[PDB]
């Protein structure tokens, strides 16, 4: 048992692992969109780089389970991080849904793990999540259902002029 | 009787207490539009923040009539603050329709109280609305009813693009 | 159900909207503090500016509460704004115990909604108000209480000195 | 005829002349106000040279009208200017209220100006009281009903005390 160990249960544990494992499926899924936004068939990069730097916030989401893990007297424990479920992503419709139902996921699961902190009696986890991921979350998914909206306004997927100008004003300009 | 009291008639005090409660109507109506505008399935920022910030405008309205009504020796009564008359806005093109109408009958208000404080003989009252008020009325009527020449223009109801370029172009950048 | 809504129980969405209802008769109340407090028979100009101050904080979690629903996808529903209890405050001392008492009851107002919040297991409203309004809230009553207590001390009701006094040294210079 | 005189009737210009004489009577009430808080058995020096200031307002109030009569061709008349109706002022709430009534009728008397040039139809004499006189006038009239109700509170007169403090407090340190 770590010297430091306190209050900290092998279920929350080995949680906490899962979910460093999931935000880092949720990075490499985010470098997918960002590589199929960067294509010459593609060429939307104001999405392309929106994506990229949501891949860079996961992994540095995955990183602070990990700096957490190891205050708590836990036991970093990596698994493979698998392949995201599409190679292409359609348009920039098809992807925000994607990411959309990726960050509900993600959501759920920190959601289910505030559960278990709750249930085990560990406040510092239930702190934690509460002050470094669940408000964020909550942001990351109200900007992408917006966007989703005005895709839909814009008229997607038929409508290409309406993808261009997304893409010139809806994301920030790289 | 007020110390200060002088040449300010009963009927002026009170119809300046029914135009304070007016102007609270009016800020929450655009409240209320604010509100609708940031909802995730409309998600027009910039629209959104046009409104919140005539609001807050047709509040500071408010409380410059109270002012008036301590400095002329009446005493402010408040009534309740009626809830708006819609609870969804539409689209754009309908809730700046309804801020014209709104606008309008505040300017109506406005134009009935000069009426009353000219038929008085009350020339303060009568500046302070022909200074702080009637123009800055006209200049917001003007600035509504150019917005609604260009949805018409932009194809709304129909037309999602023409929409999504109205609030990139036509209000301020929030 | 909004594309964005997750853990969000109809129960918290309807109490959130209660909650920004009763911010708004709140901030309602102290604007009526003000006008009383700035009248000519009055005339205490800082503790007038102090409850014109506290309105708008009022205003502004109102505001907050909006921003909240609409985030979680939550529908943002409003009532009249219903007229505080009186037309006229007293004196100071009248008009701090019955902030005291209104800052009460919107303590328990924000303490009924953590309990719902408990009860539904939605954490991130549970932060929600820790975060953005519970420990301002206790701060708040503290002021107040001090107040009230140094109200007493100078001797109100009775000793205008002392509530002169209390104006020029316990409330900032506005 | 003067070469520039248009639409000045001959009753304002008289009017004009003697509201000229009326702010200098009242810039000379103030004087005898200031020397008498200034006297070494008063000693009120932020009270003086409170009084002292409005002597000098007045006094510039009354080469406005100077100025305003050679700009509509009419001719400067000029009278006696009487010598205040008291030589002592008793303490601070005789002064402010003498002061009172002395606005009180200044006011009535721009009031009844303004009748006479919408009696004439004169819009220019019109707009200049409402924009150079009627609203600062209303600004000093509550200032001073502020002041009286302060020093009432103080428990003036007999309490020199109360007297003291308003005199550190209420009127700004010169
Ligand atoms: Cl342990
Ligand atoms: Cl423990
Ligand atoms: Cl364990
Ligand atoms: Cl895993
Ligand atoms: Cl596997
Ligand atoms: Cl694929
Ligand atoms: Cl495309
Ligand atoms: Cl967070
Ligand atoms: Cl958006
Ligand atoms: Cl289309
Ligand atoms: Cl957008
Ligand atoms: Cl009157
Ligand atoms: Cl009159
Ligand atoms: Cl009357
Ligand atoms: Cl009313
Ligand atoms: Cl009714
Ligand atoms: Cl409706
Ligand atoms: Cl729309
Ligand atoms: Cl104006
Ligand atoms: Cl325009
Ligand atoms: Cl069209
Ligand atoms: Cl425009
Ligand atoms: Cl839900
Ligand atoms: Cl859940
Ligand atoms: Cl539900
Ligand atoms: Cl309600
Ligand atoms: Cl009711
Ligand atoms: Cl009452
Ligand atoms: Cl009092
Ligand atoms: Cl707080
Ligand atoms: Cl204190
Ligand atoms: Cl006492
Ligand atoms: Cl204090
Ligand atoms: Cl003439
Ligand atoms: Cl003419
Ligand atoms: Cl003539
Ligand atoms: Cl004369
Ligand atoms: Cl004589
Ligand atoms: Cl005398
Ligand atoms: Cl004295
Ligand atoms: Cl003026
Ligand atoms: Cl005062
Ligand atoms: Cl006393
Ligand atoms: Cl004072
Ligand atoms: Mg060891
Ligand atoms: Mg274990
Ligand atoms: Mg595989
Ligand atoms: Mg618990
Ligand atoms: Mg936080
Ligand atoms: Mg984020
Ligand atoms: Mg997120
Ligand atoms: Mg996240
Ligand atoms: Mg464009
Ligand atoms: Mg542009
Ligand atoms: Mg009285
Ligand atoms: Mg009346
Ligand atoms: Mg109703
Ligand atoms: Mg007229
Ligand atoms: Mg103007
Ligand atoms: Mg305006
Ligand atoms: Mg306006
Ligand atoms: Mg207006
Ligand atoms: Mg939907
Ligand atoms: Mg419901
Ligand atoms: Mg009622
Ligand atoms: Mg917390
Ligand atoms: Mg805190
Ligand atoms: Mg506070
Ligand atoms: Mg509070
Ligand atoms: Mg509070
Ligand atoms: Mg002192
Ligand atoms: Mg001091
Ligand atoms: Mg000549
Ligand atoms: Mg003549
Ligand atoms: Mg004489
Ligand atoms: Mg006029
Ligand atoms: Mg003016
Ligand atoms: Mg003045
Ligand atoms: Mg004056
Ligand atoms: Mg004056």
């Not at 424990?77 to 509900?104: C, F, H, S, Y």
């Not at 996921?105 to 702190?127: G, I, M």
Request: charged share 30%; proline share 2%.
């Amino acid at each position: 048992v770590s010297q430091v160990r306190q209050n900290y249960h092998s279920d929350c544990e080995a949680a906490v692992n899962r979910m460093l494992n999931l935000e880092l499926y949720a990075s490499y899924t985010y470098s997918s969109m960002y590589a199929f936004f960067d294509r010459d068939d593609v060429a939307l990069h104001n999405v392309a780089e929106f994506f990229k730097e949501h891949s860079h916030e996961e992994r540095e989401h995955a990183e602070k389970f990990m700096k957490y893990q190891n205050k708590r007297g836990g036991r970093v424990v990596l698994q493979d991080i698998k392949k995201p479920e599409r190679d292409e992503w359609g348009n920039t419709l098809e992807a925000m849904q994607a990411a959309l139902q990726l960050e509900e996921t993600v959501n759920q699961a920190l959601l289910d793990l505030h559960k278990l902190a709750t249930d085990k009696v560990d406040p510092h986890l239930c702190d934690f999540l509460e002050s470094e991921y669940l408000e964020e979350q909550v942001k990351d998914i109200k900007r992408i259902g917006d966007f989703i909206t005005n895709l839909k306004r814009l008229g997607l997927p038929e409508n290409g002029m309406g993808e261009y100008l997304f893409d010139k004003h809806s994301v920030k300009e790289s």
